[PDB]
Design a protein around this ligand. Structure first.
Ligand SMILES: Nc1nc2c(ncn2[C@@H]2O[C@H](COP(=O)(O)OP(=O)(O)O)[C@@H](O)[C@H]2O)c(=O)[nH]1
Ligand SMILES: [Mg+2]
Length: 656
């Protein structure tokens, strides 16, 4: 009941509204005649369907979901062929070196041309797609599908899937069918030698030869077999399954994952159920009654239900209580989860999305990197009126655990809770996450940028404090030397008091006091970073001095002594991989250098052209729509924070 050669772990990446969701939903209907990844069966093959992100912008989620799957299907709204975003989604496919096939959906829709896809496929996606099926009909006249591979046709009596009759191709669509059979074998002959020789001598190859050959090609990334249908009208979907088994890869065709030994050495993990074990927990999905199910693709070895696996990313052991394969209607308990297969685990306390798992006495291989995002997008948030402040921070509790990658901070002045993250969308999703499924309605603020502040020249000034007989005598007096530290060298304190000049007891306050003003730079009101303070002189009032009057004695000096060291804003200067069609280069490169950018290289990937840059995050708000407009939607870009840098003189002056 387990042959690695019969699995087929696949995804469904479509432009929104192409039918990512409606194709799957109709894919289960046909499979199930007997939710992250959702196993199922078609002619003696298992087909674990990983879920690919909703919006294809999701990059990181996308990265994962990619890594987790073997084959993949692209769904094209056959109104517009490869859609602008369906164009962008192909980019991701191209990237992660994943074999695939394509689905012309909506052939009933008014606006139903196949060739439209084919043309703008090779034309816009550099695909060299191959035609395997020809419609019988056009719009709402669409009556079937021809398989030019096997030279037969299927018909569809009703818009249901109740009626599918195998019919010999109509005399009408015959001369077209024959031309494309040939033209195809010309692509099969491109892979099999025995096929060419039979094309020439005029011999008909064999269905296997054909399909066998076409498969090497689909797989080895040299084509993209192309079928069509309407998932709405329930036609050609079966074929699409007959496709997947035929062309889409088992976990044995795709290459082994690049895993990293702890010594640095990066070795390759070969799909072997009877060897050391490792897996990837990509999806921490919170079930109802069962609890924290974490979803895992297994690469080597076997997962036994009731065992002790090692969370290699965190470092703590985990116990696998039950092993689940979630199906279309119901769950499933299993004892094994072998290699190349996918599923759900029960237990695993401290295991988050991405964490790698290996088994007890097994090599500690990590599969995912170590990216801890520098916090760059600050967002301010009052509750509704402290009716929703209740379930505000108690809401962050669940959110924090399963995702480490975001600050939470109460802002100095306004006391507004402040959420510090990576990207913009990263933050926006949580608003919908909170103002809806968390029942935390409230007052939101515009994304801000993580400006930090610092000095440049070394200063040397004090910070007294006097409030005598109010209510009992109060007093305290510091004298400090501050100098600027190198970038992202952060804080350093030094105590060079001679002795006795200030009481030993009261230093903590001076420190607690410095630390409290470094949350408010004089330039805007952002955390002062990169500095070296030195307490060296002072005075005290023997009775009047107190833990309060030296917290203030000290705060009054870090505040004051900043506005003297020629203060300076620093800003987040990002790193960008913008994907533009080769035609819009001279156009958007201009866009970067308008946003104080500094272009680095340009290296080709696919029919496209990618460009590495140094735009200030400060100049990035709305860059999506500005590039979607300059590439007519064809563009796409990704950020990866790089460093903090100074702001130029004219940049600062305006910053108030
Ligand atoms: N004409 C036509 N419309 C479809 C078909 N499949 C899906 N749709 C429409 O696609 C829209 C959204 O598709 P959806 O399942 O949400 O795809 P997704 O947005 O990419 O996940 C729905 O409003 C459907 O009516 C099809 O085969 N033919
Ligand atoms: Mg959808």
């Amino acid at each position: 009941e387990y042959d690695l050669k019969r699995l087929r772990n696949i995804g469904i990446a479509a432009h929104i509204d192409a039918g990512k969701t409606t194709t799957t939903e109709r894919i289960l209907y046909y499979t199930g005649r007997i939710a992250a990844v959702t196993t199922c069966f078609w002619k003696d093959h298992r087909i674990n369907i990983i879920d690919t992100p909703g919006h294809v912008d999701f990059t990181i989620e996308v990265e994962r979901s990619m890594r987790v799957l073997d084959g993949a299907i692209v769904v094209f709204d056959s109104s517009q062929g490869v859609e602008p975003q369906s164009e962008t989604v192909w980019r991701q496919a191209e990237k992660y070196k994943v074999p695939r096939i394509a689905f012309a959906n909506k052939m009933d829709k008014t606006g139903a041309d196949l060739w439209l896809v084919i043309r703008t496929m090779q034309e816009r996606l550099g695909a060299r797609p191959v035609v395997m099926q020809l419609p019988i009909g056009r719009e709402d006249t669409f009556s079937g599908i021809i398989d030019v591979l096997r030279m037969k046709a299927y018909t569809y009596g009703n818009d249901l899937g109740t009626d599918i009759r195998e019919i010999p191709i109509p005399e009408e669509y015959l001369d077209q069918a024959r031309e494309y059979h040939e033209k195809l074998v010309e692509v099969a002959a491109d892979f099999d030698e025995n096929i060419m020789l039979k094309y020439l001598e005029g011999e008909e190859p064999t269905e296997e030869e054909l399909v066998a050959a076409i498969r090497k090609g689909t797989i080895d990334l040299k084509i993209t077999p192309v079928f069509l249908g309407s998932a709405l009208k329930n036609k050609g979907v079966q074929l699409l399954l007959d496709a997947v088994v035929d062309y889409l890869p088992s976990p044995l065709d795709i290459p082994p994952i690049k895993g990293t030994t702890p010594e640095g050495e990066v070795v390759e993990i070969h799909p072997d159920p009877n060897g050391p074990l490792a897996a990837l927990a990509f999806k921490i999905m919170a079930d109802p009654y069962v609890g924290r199910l974490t979803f895992i693709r297994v690469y080597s070895g076997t997962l036994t239900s009731g065992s002790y696996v090692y969370n290699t990313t965190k470092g703590r052991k985990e116990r696998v209580a039950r092993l689940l394969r979630m199906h279309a209607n119901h769950r499933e308990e299993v004892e094994e989860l072998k290699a190349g297969d996918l599923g759900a685990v029960v237990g695993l306390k401290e295991t988050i999305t991405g964490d790698t798992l290996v088994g007890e006495d097994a090599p500690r291989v990590i599969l995912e990197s170590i990216e801890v995002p520098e916090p760059v997008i600050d967002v301010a948030i009052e509750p509704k009126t402290k009716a929703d402040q209740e379930k505000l921070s108690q809401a962050l509790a669940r959110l924090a655990e399963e995702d480490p990658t975001f600050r939470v901070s109460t802002h100095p002045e306004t006391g507004q809770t402040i959420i510090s993250g990576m990207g913009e969308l990263h933050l926006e999703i949580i608003v919908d996450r909170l103002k809806r499924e968390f029942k935390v309605d409230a007052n939101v603020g515009k994304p801000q940028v993580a400006y930090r502040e610092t000095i440049t020249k070394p200063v040397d000034v004090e910070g007294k404090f006097i409030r005598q007989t109010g209510g009992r005598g109060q007093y305290g007096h510091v004298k400090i030397k501050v100098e600027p530290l190198p970038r992202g060298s952060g804080f350093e304190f030094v105590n060079a008091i001679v002795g006795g000049v200030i009481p030993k007891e009261y230093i903590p306050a001076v420190q607690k006091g410095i630390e409290e003003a470094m949350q408010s730079g004089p330039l805007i009101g952002f955390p002062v970073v990169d500095i070296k303070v030195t307490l060296y002189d002072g005075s005290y009032h023997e009775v009047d001095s107190s833990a309060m009057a030296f917290k203030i004695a000290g705060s009054m000096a870090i505040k004051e002594a900043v506005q003297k060291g020629d203060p300076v804003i620093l800003e987040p200067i990002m790193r960008v991989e913008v994907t533009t069609p080769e035609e819009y280069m001279g156009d958007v490169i201009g866009d970067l250098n308008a946003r104080r950018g500094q272009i680095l290289g340009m290296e080709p990937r696919g029919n496209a052209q990618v460009i590495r840059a140094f735009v200030p995050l400060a100049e990035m708000f709305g860059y999506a729509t500005d590039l979607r407009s300059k590439t007519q939607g064809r563009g796409s870009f990704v950020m990866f924070f790089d460093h903090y840098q100074e702001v130029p003189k004219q940049v600062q002056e305006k910053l108030i």
